[PDB]
């Protein structure tokens, strides 16, 4: 099937994934299904239930509801970028890179990786929030005003098709590593070497998908398509973030998030 140094590359990536993302698909699916517990997550389905939830998040304000949700999103984004950064540094070859190429890979990778992993925490009707303690409804997110209602629905559309692939966490960690180790991000210095590094990951991903989903024989090309869709998804999402920076005088981006969007698409 596949050799040792490829098997070693796979488990390094899976273990780094298990270590760096508190929420993962196995844990999310159990909450969502959901056996293992009869105490479901608090459901945030309208303005009133939202305020109930916020009465808990006291220390962590008087802004419009849309903007407060926009703030909860930023907090979740910041720490996922943070975890993603730890995860990247653990991919063999990544830390060896120019450091600059590392910033560039992360800059263009993180949001494709975020929306890939976000699927895990979404079903057709809503998504887990607050580390699995909440569940905010899709319809409620659509019910917000523009352009805030226009942020999640595309992510849901992607997630429903992506979740149809039935990936588990071992697939997803390889997929996320391939997203980040992407040889054609703009401004990369050592395109030749990064490309070598990604073809190793992509190779481990292909053989792993053969072994883990034998009947779904075009799963890998499907995943390749998903990577192109993620790029489009992120470009459009970047466009919406720009429209908000210069149209909503009350939704400042976290500094780290300004770093990533600055000079992107």
């Amino acid at each position: 099937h596949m050799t040792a140094d490829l098997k070693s590359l796979a488990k390094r990536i899976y273990e780094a994934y298990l270590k760096n993302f508190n929420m993962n698909k196995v844990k999310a699916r159990v909450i969502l299904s959901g056996k293992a517990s009869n105490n479901p997550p608090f459901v945030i389905h309208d303005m009133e239930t939202l305020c109930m939830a916020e009465k808990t998040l006291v220390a962590k304000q008087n802004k419009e509801a849309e903007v407060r949700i926009f703030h909860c999103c930023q907090c979740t984004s910041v720490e996922t970028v943070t975890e993603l950064t730890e995860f990247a540094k653990a991919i063999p070859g990544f830390a060896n890179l120019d450091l600059n190429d590392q910033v560039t890979l992360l800059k263009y990778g993180v949001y494709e990786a975020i929306f890939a992993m976000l699927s895990s925490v979404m079903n057709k009707d809503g998504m887990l929030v607050a580390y699995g303690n909440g569940f905010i409804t899709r319809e409620f997110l659509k019910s917000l005003r523009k352009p805030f209602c226009d942020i999640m629905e595309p992510k849901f559309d992607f997630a429903m098709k992506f979740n149809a692939l039935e990936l588990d966490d071992s697939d997803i960690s390889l997929f996320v590593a391939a997203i980040i180790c992407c040889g054609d991000r703009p401004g990369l210095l050592n395109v030749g070497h990064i490309e070598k590094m990604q073809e190793g990951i992509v190779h481990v991903l292909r053989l792993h998908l053969q072994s883990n989903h034998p009947d779904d024989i075009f799963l890998f090309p499907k995943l390749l398509q998903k990577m192109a869709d993620l790029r489009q998804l992120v470009t459009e999402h970047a466009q919406l973030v720009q429209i908000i920076k210069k149209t909503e005088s009350d939704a400042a981006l976290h500094p780290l998030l300004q770093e990533i969007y600055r000079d992107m698409y």
Partner: peptide
């Protein structure tokens, strides 16, 4: 230009 991201990659 990416000072926080640099920071994160060092620690």
């Amino acid at each position: 230009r990416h000072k926080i991201l640099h920071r994160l990659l060092q620690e």
